[PDB]
């Protein structure tokens, strides 16, 4: 506590340089600190949460301020198809004159960047039309971040610290989250959409100065309190409505139309308002379920205890699964991360099919960035969920309390689970690789008609069951006599069937033999990743090779060379191995999406539809072909706007390759090198007046794996972000 | 850009001076035995 890490003595007494490194690494593991109790930990979590919220809101306010100060939002508002959104301005004293002339595009007076984050369409949809509104939002967000910092400091003072028993009040916390944080927030958003967004879309200005004056419906609040609710769905906007003006706009605030606005090719604002109202009511109703202190309500422990089916098919049921999830923070963290990582892939899969912002789906370089970003975030989150499940199993699981519940029977038969995941992954990989190589040989020998092309009949049948009329299946929504059809014929199918049967948007694109193989490669990737992560999480407490792994912790290098060799054995190493497969799976998914959409936007879908069934087609028609303007970002004849990407791209590669340096070569070489480097420094004149304090040592084993994985991941992300932005924005579809 | 003289004031004060002083402060805090 007298050196850099004051929360640990083992690192304080470390004379080597490692003291620095492991001080930054184990800086947020509040559990494994010195003199930690269950009431300091929770309050530190609370204060760190407040700080995190402050940082998030400061970031958002910075985005607002920088788009308002240097951007061209007002110009973009009146021509959102023939202008490029500016992110911010650049001031680089290393620039040259051609670079200044190249990056000064758009409407700006100097060199600037172009915003590929889609914030322009978002802000324009919800009803922002002037830099003044952006500045007001920015200062308000500065204010709320200051308030969050105030509260974070306040709840650490001795008078106002919450007790550990207050945090564990799961019933009231879930009740209040569900009711307020979801329903009331969705209700407030519905109010804003009704008051400010929809009228500003119709054309009329509505701000704070006239909130209580301008009502959002010619007969506001009368029909509502009288139950005549259809009055708010009388006349919506027509196909002739110009988003922003009143040229053919209705007056309904809530409705169910389905489909896309014919001009903006995005969902109807009134539809979003209605959806938010519905889910707000649903969440508010679902709030009042658990007993807080009012007599009525459930006891979330006796619900768990009551679900042991008679017959002992799964042991003692869920008896005891309340205390484990309540006392252990890693269980809650894993559940939270898994449930969050499923919906942060749901948003990615939805926002491209049903674009929710005005004049999206026409920024062919923004949707790609959004999809790739959210899918990589989802991959990292899904890996973290399993990591924290493993940590829970290692340091939080009590085999005596969890006596014969489901959680114990998962450990009881883990060999079967790992065996079957192994079989599934092996089967998928064998057959996918076999078919791809067979098609490769068939195309190589000049006979393309001998390759195994498989139509995805199940997904095509599903699409036909959603109303698509390409495959002629005529099932359950293409059939005109099915009751499912007649039910929604008056409400929304006129728009849904119209949008889905238009083969120019991303709503249920057509699929052929080339999609089948990529979906199976995706299944193989998912299966192998979950296999690695589940094997780690399960054999994290102990295996036959090392049946005391729980006593050594989460991350430890190895258990010596003996017993045949036990290198790379911990569960942290399972996670480190699974990160590679996560990155590979997400790369496959993003390659598929980007090639499909490039070929859709260009105009020749029959290039993907025909050159993807083999594997050289991916290397030649996607990677090699779409890299012609990227690498030509600068040359002995000049440079152009893509030059920065042409740098970043190469940059990526370098970092990526450097990762290999930390993964192939191991410590015993570098330590024996440092031991002579130190000699050389000591035995030279004029340079032994200086002297190191921390003894120089080679990086540790798990530290080397961590640095290698970090380099690999940074390079993998950068050399693909650069490529996806340059190859698309350099052509714009 | 309204000011247009602030980017010439801040990025030299945030990419050169800010790291130069925070690295020195953190090095004094790291290499001390208290």
């Amino acid at each position: 506590a007298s050196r850099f890490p004051k929360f640990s003595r083992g690192l304080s007494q470390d004379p080597t340089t490692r003291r620095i490194w492991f001080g930054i690494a184990t800086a947020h593991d509040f559990e494994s600190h010195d003199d930690m109790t269950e009431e300091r930990l929770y309050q530190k979590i609370f204060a760190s949460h407040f700080g995190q919220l402050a940082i998030i809101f400061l970031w958002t306010s910075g985005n607002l301020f920088h788009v308002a100060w240097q951007g061209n939002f007002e110009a973009w508002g009146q021509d959102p198809l023939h202008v490029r959104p500016i992110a911010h301005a650049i001031w680089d004293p290393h620039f040259g004159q051609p670079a200044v002339e190249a990056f000064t595009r758009g409407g700006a007076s100097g060199p600037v960047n172009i915003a590929y984050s889609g914030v322009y369409q978002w802000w324009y949809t919800i009803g922002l039309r002037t830099n003044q509104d952006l500045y007001g939002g920015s200062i308000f967000l500065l204010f709320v971040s200051a308030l969050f910092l105030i509260a974070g400091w306040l709840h650490l003072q001795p008078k106002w610290k919450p007790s550990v028993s207050w945090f564990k009040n799961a019933e009231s916390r879930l009740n209040h989250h569900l009711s307020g944080l979801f329903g009331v927030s969705s209700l407030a958003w519905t109010g804003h959409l009704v008051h400010v967004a929809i009228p500003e879309s119709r054309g009329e200005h509505v701000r704070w100065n006239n909130l209580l004056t301008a009502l959002p419906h010619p007969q506001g609040l009368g029909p509502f309190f009288a139950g005549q609710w259809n009055v708010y769905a009388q006349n919506p906007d027509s196909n002739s409505h110009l988003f922003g003006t009143s040229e053919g706009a209705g007056t309904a605030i809530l409705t169910f139309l389905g489909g896309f606005h014919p001009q903006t090719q995005s969902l109807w604002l009134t539809d979003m308002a209605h959806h938010h109202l519905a889910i707000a009511v649903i969440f508010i109703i679902a709030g009042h379920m658990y007993r807080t202190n009012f007599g009525i309500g459930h006891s979330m422990k006796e619900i768990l205890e009551a679900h042991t089916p008679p017959g002992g098919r799964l042991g003692r049921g869920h008896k005891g699964l309340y205390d484990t999830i309540n006392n252990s923070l890693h269980f809650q963290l894993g559940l939270a991360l898994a449930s969050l990582g499923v919906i942060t892939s749901l948003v990615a899969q939805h926002m491209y099919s049903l674009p929710p912002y005005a004049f999206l789906a026409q920024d062919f370089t923004t949707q790609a960035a959004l999809y790739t970003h959210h899918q990589y975030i989802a991959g990292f989150i899904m890996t973290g969920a399993f990591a924290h499940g493993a940590i829970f199993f290692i340091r939080d699981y009590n085999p005596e309390q969890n006596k014969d519940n489901v959680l114990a029977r998962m450990l009881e038969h883990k060999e079967a689970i790992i065996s079957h995941l192994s079989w599934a992954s092996l089967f998928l990989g064998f057959h996918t690789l076999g078919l791809y190589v067979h098609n490769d040989v068939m195309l190589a020998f000049g006979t393309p008609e001998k390759q195994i092309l498989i139509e995805p009949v199940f997904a095509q049948w599903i699409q036909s069951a959603h109303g698509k009329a390409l495959y002629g299946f005529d099932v359950l929504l293409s059939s005109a006599d099915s009751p499912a059809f007649n039910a929604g014929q008056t409400l929304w199918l006129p728009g849904w069937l119209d949008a889905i049967n238009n083969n120019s948007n991303s709503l249920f694109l057509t699929i052929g033999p080339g999609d089948f193989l990529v979906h199976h490669a995706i299944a193989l990737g998912l299966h192998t990743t979950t296999l690695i992560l589940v094997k780690g999480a399960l054999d994290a407490r102990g295996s036959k090779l090392m049946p005391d792994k729980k006593e050594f912790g989460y991350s430890f290098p190895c258990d010596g060379p003996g017993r045949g060799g036990t290198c790379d054995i911990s569960a942290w190493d399972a996670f480190y191995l699974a990160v590679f497969w996560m990155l590979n799976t997400i790369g496959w998914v993003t390659f598929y999406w980007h090639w499909k959409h490039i070929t859709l936007w260009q105009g020749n879908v029959a290039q993907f539809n025909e050159s993807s069934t083999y594997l050289m087609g991916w290397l030649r028609d996607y990677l090699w072909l779409n890299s012609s303007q990227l690498i030509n970002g600068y040359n002995p004849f000049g440079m152009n706007s893509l030059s920065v990407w042409a740098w970043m791209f190469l940059f990526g590669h370098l970092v990526w390759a450097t990762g290999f340096m930390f993964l192939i070569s191991w410590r015993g070489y570098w330590q024996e090198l440092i031991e002579t480097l130190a000699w050389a420094h000591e035995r030279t004149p004029l340079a032994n007046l200086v002297r190191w304090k921390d003894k120089p040592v080679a990086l540790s084993i798990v530290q080397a794996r961590l640095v290698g994985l970090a380099h690999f991941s940074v390079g993998y992300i950068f050399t693909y972000a650069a490529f996806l932005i340059a190859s698309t924005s350099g052509k714009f579809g | 850009m309204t000011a247009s003289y602030l980017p010439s004031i801040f990025v030299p004060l945030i990419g050169l001076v800010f790291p130069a002083i925070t690295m020195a402060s953190l090095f004094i805090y790291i290499e001390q035995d208290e």
Partner: peptide, 29 residues
């Protein structure tokens, strides 16, 4: 922030928020 004083307002507000974050960090350590 098309005006001039508004940038100064943003700067001073950012400074206040920075002092608040400083106090919070000191309390967290």
């Amino acid at each position: 922030s098309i005006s001039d004083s508004q940038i100064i307002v943003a700067l001073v507000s950012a400074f206040i928020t920075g002092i608040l974050a400083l106090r919070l960090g000191k309390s967290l350590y």
